[PDB]
Design a protein around this ligand. Structure first.
Ligand code: FES
Ligand code: FES
Ligand code: FES
Ligand code: FE2
Ligand code: FE2
Ligand code: FE2
Lengths: 440, 186, 186, 186, 440, 440
């Protein structure tokens, strides 16, 4: 199969080259389920998805279905959505409120903590004189639990007891996240309705685009999307090129962000003038700048980001989504919209409507993004095409593109530095068996 | 009834409308589908009233006691939630020759049936439910099938089709969207 | 003709029925489908006459000289073979909130077309053939498509829909059932 | 208009045709589909006029500036391009019991909707557009779905169906044919 | 791949644990086709499916299509439905009467015994002066034959010349089968119409349920099914719990049965009062009890059974079916209804109608059964979920649950003893290359 | 996996046997993509598909999408339809005229030669002071090119620099091709409209049938097809058997052809009397016979041929097609119709109409051909069925079936000599790593 050496060779960040096999190979995909999704922090939803005791959300870690559920002590637990008797899905709804989770096959019932608490016929069929006296103990048969940590509203989970805690894993990337998540003491909240759709491409195309690829938006991909936002009197001949900005590569972990500087037009085309004003001027913007002092946030526009492997979002448009993998050739997008909890309701309503318009299965920006990933994937079915050496050189050894205004490693807004770190980090996770070496 | 829950059947009138009205409404829908299926997007958009609200809510999966949570409500996230202005922008995108998800264009068929008409309390205004099957195929082998229900408010209109669409709500019979996008109109 | 072989075309009347009757029958079918597609199972069951026979025979694959063996005959195994009493039990199951194959419930669309009506020798009784496309989707990604033909005996009735179903025979255009169950009504 | 491009919408008449004519044409189509779906091939062929031209052009995938190349033109390769004589031969093959692609026979359903009628300048002659969904299943598990549009010239006729098909052009909403053959009639 | 040791570890009958990989792993599935389906006795149909000379039935052994056909001497033969020239299906119908089976590709024709008897152009193209004189001999090119044996009406087949005969393989299970198959000197007959449908689950979920799992019916799975049978005046509050019965584990081979004792309500809900009376009282029941003296058959109600690997049935309801495997993630159910050949026709008609009502693709019991298997299968796509250790402990080392009234090893009606023997037997077949050790 | 020895054993041309695994095994299929399609000459289309500068056709080599495009110097180039940045399809249309091929993801633009000529933001993002000064050179990032050669109108391509040239690879088969391709100094032309359809069978069934299998047409497969062409007054009782003809096995490479001799009825049933007269009598036929002097072309009727691996055609009917493989269990047929460029237009129109009638997705001959391949494939899903030893003995060691009128190795029209050489050649390609031994 694949030696660590064989896997590391698929990615060359020094020479800027990627082996196309990373996006199609089935054997590599199964190793990703073990070595990447099995021990990464994965985004499941937002605390506001499960405000009250017994509230739950069913979602995924990789291809494993899990239940995320608010506990009596206000903690959140996450466990596999699988009965330990014969494997039935315990919870069949997308979310709701429970006092108990019951398996409909043989009626095994679980409390909201995931403990097994009721086995029909235990007394008659599973023991002799008292519970547990013939080797059957309900304590033994609870579904696998994940580690759970939140970061300013976002709920992340990780199966691996040996992995670093959440903040450690986030490396030097937290201020970039804060641009969206920490603008106000009030925190954020999720607009109801997670939109879910299926794209026949590899997760890494989508993870990489939000990590490192403003290039596609500053060139061809979103011309018609921008056009959709213009008044009848204007055409694409009256839209100026965007050339000034930077991108960030996290010190550890494969995270990435990019943005334009001191040009609000990228943002204006997607979110409109009302949100642009809110984002930049007045008391809410002032408070944000005090709350995220590590960054010149009022000069940053149209930011993209990925928290590796699959949590991606666009601060200021405020779409956020997880890419659930479905083999090497398919992904599900699970997206929702975040708003500052104390924003005026006209602002919340504009975030809601502009999001549906743009970054949505039906949206005028997203539809063109996915069409690209799907066509790439189709071509990689070819035998020559699947082994192509792809160019990740953009920005490589190109000097004087960093920006000392920003923490950590930076490069030009049109660059693949973030992308190179993403694939470099993937190759580490894929080739190093233990956190002994992998941890920051 | 315009605010009947989407989970509930259409509130048809005690007796069906006249044959003549049924025929005019059906014939309107068949012409609308011709425009869409032949990518006549400007001509189709002319059918949308200036006060159009075009919406397609998200549908979720729920067990018996939380069935009233099936539909994500108005005022929350949705698949479409559009006005005459936003629909105009969508149409600009569709006719630009830069819409990569539609370049090359999809092959669609909108089959229209099960048309039930209700006359509203304003003369010239109708509430209409219908079933659809939207077949979409594109490029070499891609096929997406969508089925569902449309509930419209139609207004009689002086255009060559004789109506405009004042409201359109689309029930899609999916929870997870199984297509890679919703790059076609319903 | 009620006992025409299911392999044979419908015995339509020399000339089509009146427009008015065609419209009443179509409108009835569209209301029936609304009830099913919105899971109005009690209201739907009210449409079944007390003497209803609801049947869906098994279809087999045969070469030319054994083509008369295509349909498994009446009086043998079948997919449905029901009375008012057994259909009642099915409806109790469907409305119980314990029908795990329908909990959560399927999303269905019954498209009704190709309606051909024949007036029978008893006033108020009709034999009707129609084509259907039944779209069913459930849970995250499951989709089943069923297509076929229904041959009904309808009786005019004093209910708000104006008919009851006295007989329903369903031709399904499958031999092996490709869905994991037949947990929906046709 | 008989030579409207297949990429362009149907040129419907300023106002829809009478209810009576709509009903006669629809009823004709439903009887035609019954004949096909019950493999009444001789009876179906009787509906083809002696001067029939039955054609289904090839559809190709093109980017914006070469969209007028979508349809492979008349006079070039095609999926069907038939006369009364060649269609007769196809019918001989279909009724021979030696047509291995149809032995055992396919299970088909032709759903007919979106019927738009235009009266032509010769009395008794109509141009009709309609949408179709052709469901085909065969052997254990094979299913092919075809969707598209038919544009016909119908002539009133003294046969028990009252029309013959003088021209049929089929728009199929596929480029690459996704089925292993086109062993069914549209 | 998989060592015998690696395979045996997937099943622990001593500690009562199952590795979930048995239901999803593709490599294990291919070994099942070789080591289980390739050398097990598989149920194909009933003698009454092919009463007359030249009558045939096409069906399956695993994923191999076979022809079962009545011979001139009234014997039955079974051979692969595959032309030896280029592989075409020889017979394209579900069943009928033949004098010959002809391949439509090049017209090679086979007699009803499966011998090749007519090669078009043999004289001009395949030999010189007389048939066989250039190395082509029709005797060499007949499709593979299976061993065939019947057991009281049921036709079973086996490819493996080294496997034990049918009755030997049936171990101590025949009386349990006889409860359905040997109630009368007249034998049984199949109602016409084999119902076939596709369930996206592993065959072992269905094989196990009919082997050992009354638990699911005494708890949650069939509440609505039972409700469907009640008069308007009754509800589920007037149905008593069922707690008394036993199950059987065959001495060898993975077979299993279970039933309730001296409580006809399980049976009544499915088959109705007319069949319940016929099953228990009067001349037909009396004769059955004389014919199956090894068992107290008039005290047994709602019996389930599996003859390993995939022949399952419900004596007294009289549904019978084979689970044809279609990869690890799919099965076809091929089911039919058996009735005593000399039953009154009103009884036959009640069996027919109650069967369609209940254990049928549309049935009010079956639809809920399959929904369970399908959801399990979906969950096992997960990486953690596919390697779960599942509980097969029920009844393990729970004393004094046997019943000396019944032959062989017995346990409580709510137990997994039968199930444990099923998986233990699967693991033997999967890990032992030769009948030298595997045979009873 | 598969040793050369293991692969050679799948084909025995000395004893006339084929292992069925060749048509289903996935591992063998991937080796076919490397060892067969990766280094064979594959038919892409006809020069007349791309008459003018900048004209292009998108098609396939195996499962790799390629662009075939007419160059400024009238040469033709073929290169992979895949962007070297992230893999997007460069060209999204079936064909047209271009001055440049632009990738819609990041706007990388390629000239019609396949060179990368425009990288958006190269100056700002990819270099320092001048192009190429930081390691990024557009010359490095063009899509893979194929070798391209034409043979009398047909365009073939090959990835492998070490493979033999086209004519060398064609061995002694060119005169047989010339029967269709070289009848006139005017050459041939393609009728517009490539018909494309998907058949769920292995490519080798279709490649073999056109290589070597007239047998299926002289027996059962096309009875109804022939019947479709008869006048109402005739039936199949008035069609004489066809028994006289020969077939050809190329000296090297797996090519094959067969035909009837001095009996035009095979041809008449497919092409009609007008084409039959044109093919046999008058100035066009006379000139053909002068142009192909190595063969008695006016005595040859209903010829079939395959140029290995996947270029097949029927001289005189003039259907031609490539079988694009789509895994072991699927193929796409891409077919078109060729006519002599100087034929009278009534003749061209008859070729066009008779082709649609017969050898077309809807055609009365083709539909029955494919039904056979599809049913074979379905059966090979079986475990026993997939390992069957199939008979390729027809004609083996049957003496005195050659015809000295024809060049190279010949045998009876009903024979599998051509077929045996096809599979023998496949086994060589599959087991010999280097042209050192594989070349003629
Ligand atoms: S599978 Fe959950 S209780 Fe049995
Ligand atoms: S494949 Fe059966 S005779 Fe050739
Ligand atoms: S993938 Fe082609 S320019 Fe980026
Ligand atoms: Fe984008
Ligand atoms: Fe059950
Ligand atoms: Fe052929």
């Amino acid at each position: 199969n694949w030696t660590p050496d064989a896997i590391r060779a698929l990615v060359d960040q020094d020479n800027g080259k990627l082996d196309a096999r990373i996006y199609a190979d089935q054997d590599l995909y199964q190793l990703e389920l073990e070595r990447v999704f099995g021990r990464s922090w994965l985004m499941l939803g937002h605390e506001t998805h499960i405000p009250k005791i017994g509230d739950y959300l069913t979602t995924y870690m990789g291809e494993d279905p899990v239940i995320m559920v608010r506990q009596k002590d206000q903690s959140i637990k996450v466990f596999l959505n699988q009965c330990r008797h014969r494997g039935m899905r315990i919870v069949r709804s997308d979310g709701g409120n429970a006092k108990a989770f019951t398996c409909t096959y043989h009626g095994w019932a679980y409390d909201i903590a995931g403990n097994l608490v009721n086995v029909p016929f235990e007394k008659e069929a599973f023991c002799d004189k008292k519970e547990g006296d013939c080797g059957f103990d309900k304590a033994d048969w609870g579904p696998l639990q994940a580690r759970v940590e939140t970061y300013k509203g976002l709920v992340f989970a990780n199966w691996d007891p040996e992995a670093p805690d959440l903040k450690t894993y986030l490396s030097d990337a937290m201020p970039y996240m804060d641009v969206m998540l920490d603008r106000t003491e009030a925190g954020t909240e999720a607009i109801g309705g997670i939109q879910k759709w299926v794209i026949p491409c590899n997760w890494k195309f989508a993870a990489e685009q939000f990590c490192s690829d403003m290039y596609h938006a500053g060139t061809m991909s979103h011309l018609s999307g921008v056009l959709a936002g213009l008044p009848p009197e204007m055409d694409l001949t009256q839209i100026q090129l965007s050339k000034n900005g930077n991108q960030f590569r996290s010190a550890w972990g494969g995270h990435g962000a990019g943005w334009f500087i001191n040009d609000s037009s990228i943002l204006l085309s997607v979110v409109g003038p009302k949100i642009t004003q809110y984002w930049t001027q007045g008391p809410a913007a002032e408070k944000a700048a005090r709350r995220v002092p590590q960054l010149p946030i009022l000069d940053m526009f149209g930011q993209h980001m990925t928290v590796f492997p699959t949590c991606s979002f666009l601060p200021g448009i405020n779409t956020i989504r997880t890419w659930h993998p479905r083999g090497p050739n398919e992904v599900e997008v699970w997206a929702f919209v975040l708003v500052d909890a104390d924003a005026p309701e006209d602002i919340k309503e504009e975030f809601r409507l502009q999001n549906i318009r743009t970054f949505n299965a039906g949206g005028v920006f997203e539809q063109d993004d996915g069409e690209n990933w799907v066509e790439i994937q189709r071509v990689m079915r070819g035998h020559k095409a699947k082994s192509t050496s792809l160019c990740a050189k953009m920005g490589l050894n190109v000097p004087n593109k960093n920006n000392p205004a920003y923490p950590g490693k930076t490069a030009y807004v049109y660059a693949e530095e973030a992308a190179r770190g993403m694939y470099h980090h993937w190759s580490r996770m894929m080739s190093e068996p233990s956190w002994d070496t992998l941890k920051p | 009834m315009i605010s009947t829950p989407l989970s509930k059947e259409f509130e048809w009138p005690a007796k069906p409308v006249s044959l003549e009205l049924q025929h005019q409404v059906e014939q309107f829908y068949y012409r609308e589908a011709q425009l869409l299926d032949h990518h006549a997007f400007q001509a189709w958009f002319a059918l949308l009233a200036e006060d159009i609200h075009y919406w397609m809510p998200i549908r979720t999966v729920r067990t018996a006691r939380e069935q009233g949570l099936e539909y994500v409500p108005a005022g929350a996230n949705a698949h479409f939630d559009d006005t005459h202005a936003t629909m105009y922008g969508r149409i600009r995108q569709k006719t630009s020759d830069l819409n990569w998800a539609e370049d090359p264009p999809s092959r669609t068929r909108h089959l229209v049936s099960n048309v039930i008409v209700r006359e509203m309390d304003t003369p010239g205004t109708l509430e209409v439910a219908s079933a659809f099957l939207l077949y979409r195929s594109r490029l070499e082998r891609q096929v997406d099938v969508f089925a569902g229900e449309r509930r419209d408010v139609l207004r009689i209109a002086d255009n060559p089709l004789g109506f405009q669409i004042a409201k359109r709500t689309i029930i899609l019979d999916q929870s997870t969207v199984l297509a890679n996008n919703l790059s076609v109109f319903f």
